[PDB]
Design an enzyme around this catalytic site. Structure first.
Site, PDB file in Angstrom:
ATOM      1  N   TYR A  50       0.847  -1.186   0.000  1.00  0.00           N
ATOM      2  CA  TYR A  50       0.000   0.000   0.000  1.00  0.00           C
ATOM      3  C   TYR A  50       0.886   1.240   0.000  1.00  0.00           C
ATOM      4  O   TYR A  50       1.856   1.316   0.713  1.00  0.00           O
ATOM      5  CB  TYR A  50      -0.934  -0.023   1.214  1.00  0.00           C
ATOM      6  CG  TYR A  50      -2.052   1.008   1.293  1.00  0.00           C
ATOM      7  CD1 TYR A  50      -3.018   1.147   0.302  1.00  0.00           C
ATOM      8  CD2 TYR A  50      -2.168   1.823   2.416  1.00  0.00           C
ATOM      9  CE1 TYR A  50      -4.048   2.075   0.415  1.00  0.00           C
ATOM     10  CE2 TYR A  50      -3.190   2.760   2.528  1.00  0.00           C
ATOM     11  CZ  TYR A  50      -4.131   2.900   1.528  1.00  0.00           C
ATOM     12  OH  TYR A  50      -5.112   3.847   1.708  1.00  0.00           O
ATOM     13  N   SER A  93       3.022  -6.670   1.685  1.00  0.00           N
ATOM     14  CA  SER A  93       1.947  -6.185   2.520  1.00  0.00           C
ATOM     15  C   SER A  93       0.585  -6.512   1.931  1.00  0.00           C
ATOM     16  O   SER A  93       0.152  -7.669   1.843  1.00  0.00           O
ATOM     17  CB  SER A  93       2.077  -4.723   2.705  1.00  0.00           C
ATOM     18  OG  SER A  93       1.376  -4.100   1.644  1.00  0.00           O
ATOM     19  N   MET A  94      -0.057  -5.426   1.522  1.00  0.00           N
ATOM     20  CA  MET A  94      -1.317  -5.433   0.779  1.00  0.00           C
ATOM     21  C   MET A  94      -1.191  -6.199  -0.545  1.00  0.00           C
ATOM     22  O   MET A  94      -2.144  -6.847  -0.972  1.00  0.00           O
ATOM     23  CB  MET A  94      -1.752  -3.996   0.483  1.00  0.00           C
ATOM     24  CG  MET A  94      -2.231  -3.329   1.741  1.00  0.00           C
ATOM     25  SD  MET A  94      -3.756  -2.464   1.360  1.00  0.00           S
ATOM     26  CE  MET A  94      -3.875  -1.627   2.954  1.00  0.00           C
ATOM     27  N   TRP A 149      -0.897  -8.194   4.483  1.00  0.00           N
ATOM     28  CA  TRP A 149      -2.045  -7.527   5.098  1.00  0.00           C
ATOM     29  C   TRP A 149      -3.310  -7.919   4.346  1.00  0.00           C
ATOM     30  O   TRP A 149      -3.349  -7.830   3.114  1.00  0.00           O
ATOM     31  CB  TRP A 149      -1.828  -6.005   5.047  1.00  0.00           C
ATOM     32  CG  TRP A 149      -2.828  -5.177   5.833  1.00  0.00           C
ATOM     33  CD1 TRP A 149      -2.651  -4.579   7.051  1.00  0.00           C
ATOM     34  CD2 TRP A 149      -4.171  -4.827   5.409  1.00  0.00           C
ATOM     35  NE1 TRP A 149      -3.788  -3.893   7.412  1.00  0.00           N
ATOM     36  CE2 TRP A 149      -4.732  -4.019   6.433  1.00  0.00           C
ATOM     37  CE3 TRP A 149      -4.940  -5.111   4.269  1.00  0.00           C
ATOM     38  CZ2 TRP A 149      -6.040  -3.540   6.371  1.00  0.00           C
ATOM     39  CZ3 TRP A 149      -6.220  -4.602   4.183  1.00  0.00           C
ATOM     40  CH2 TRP A 149      -6.758  -3.828   5.230  1.00  0.00           C
ATOM     41  N   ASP A 167       6.459  -5.966  13.316  1.00  0.00           N
ATOM     42  CA  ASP A 167       5.601  -5.323  12.333  1.00  0.00           C
ATOM     43  C   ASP A 167       4.406  -4.683  13.033  1.00  0.00           C
ATOM     44  O   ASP A 167       3.625  -5.366  13.684  1.00  0.00           O
ATOM     45  CB  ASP A 167       5.109  -6.294  11.248  1.00  0.00           C
ATOM     46  CG  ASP A 167       4.471  -5.645  10.026  1.00  0.00           C
ATOM     47  OD1 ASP A 167       3.787  -4.612  10.196  1.00  0.00           O
ATOM     48  OD2 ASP A 167       4.631  -6.190   8.894  1.00  0.00           O
ATOM     49  N   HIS A 173       7.713  -3.809   9.029  1.00  0.00           N
ATOM     50  CA  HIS A 173       6.955  -3.940   7.800  1.00  0.00           C
ATOM     51  C   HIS A 173       7.803  -3.555   6.588  1.00  0.00           C
ATOM     52  O   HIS A 173       7.479  -3.941   5.474  1.00  0.00           O
ATOM     53  CB  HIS A 173       5.782  -2.966   7.825  1.00  0.00           C
ATOM     54  CG  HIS A 173       4.727  -3.297   6.821  1.00  0.00           C
ATOM     55  ND1 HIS A 173       3.939  -4.430   6.970  1.00  0.00           N
ATOM     56  CD2 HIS A 173       4.308  -2.675   5.689  1.00  0.00           C
ATOM     57  CE1 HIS A 173       3.064  -4.487   5.952  1.00  0.00           C
ATOM     58  NE2 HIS A 173       3.270  -3.427   5.164  1.00  0.00           N
TER      59      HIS A 173
END
Ligand code: NA
Length: 257
Positions: free
Chosen positions: A60, A130-131, A155, A175, A207
């Site tokens: 993200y 992540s995303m 995520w 994280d 992260h």
């Protein structure tokens, strides 16, 4: 034995640096493709072989340049790797899944001929930060023809993915964006128990650990891709009887050993 075998017998050392293949790069412009925001393709050159492909999503608000090191690292070990930019840097995980899907089709059908000539489109995989890692899980569930999925510090609000695609998840202990107790670990524990699955947790990492040259990320990502995209059992050694000081947690159902 094993038509997909490429490169020398591996050592742990060799998997922390760029591998034996020279790498070429191609810039896919944002407006040249519908379905995703363009990106960069890292792929072998100087060689007559074909190799599996990987589509990889940044996280993200991030650009593809954030994963450039790992795009290059994987390609130099023998993979055609497309690191995408997203239509919007604010796209969420399931949007990222759809764009990986478009990027995989693009690699198969529309990439330059010098890329297509290096690719065996029967052998494809996904990875993401992540995303982007949440998108990696989503597409592994939507499309089980994928050979492997490697979510990095992932995520997502959805915690259960019913996929048969072998998954290795990298969590980061410290994280705070996607805490491993909320995200990475539930993803690991909710995958089907019949699916080959590995969780590795980096000691003292946050992260942003995937955003720069990282030895553990390099070893486990290369090894998982090699094992499943190339059927290359020379890499089982890094994934089995693990005793790695860099890790502060390790879980597996040991189907891959
Ligand atoms: Na820990």
């Amino acid at each position: 034995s094993n038509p997909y075998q490429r490169g020398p017998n591996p050592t742990r050392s060799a998997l922390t640096a760029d591998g034996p293949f020279s790498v070429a790069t191609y810039t896919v412009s944002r407006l040249s493709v519908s379905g995703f925001g363009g990106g960069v393709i890292y792929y072998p050159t100087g060689t007559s072989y074909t190799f599996g492909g990987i589509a990889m999503s940044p996280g993200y608000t991030a650009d593809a340049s954030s994963l450039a090191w790992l795009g290059r690292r994987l390609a130099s070990h023998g993979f055609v790797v497309l690191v995408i930019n997203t239509n919007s840097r604010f796209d969420g995980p399931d949007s990222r899944a759809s764009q990986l899907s478009a990027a995989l089709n693009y690699l198969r059908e529309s990439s330059p001929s010098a890329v297509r000539a290096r690719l065996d489109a029967n052998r494809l995989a996904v990875a993401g930060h992540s995303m982007g890692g949440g998108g990696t899980l989503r597409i592994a569930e939507q499309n089980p023809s994928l050979k492997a999925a490697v979510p990095l510090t992932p995520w997502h609000t959805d915690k259960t993915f019913n996929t048969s695609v072998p998954v290795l998840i990298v969590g980061a202990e410290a994280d705070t964006v996607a805490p491993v107790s909320q995200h990475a670990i539930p993803f690991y524990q909710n995958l089907p128990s019949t699916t080959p699955k590995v969780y590795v947790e980096l000691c003292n990492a946050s992260h942003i650990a995937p955003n720069s040259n990282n030895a553990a990320i390099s070893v486990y990502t290369i090894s998982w891709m090699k094992l499943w995209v190339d059927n290359d059992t020379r890499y089982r050694q890094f994934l089995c009887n693990v005793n790695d000081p860099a890790l502060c947690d390790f879980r597996t159902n040991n189907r891959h050993c």
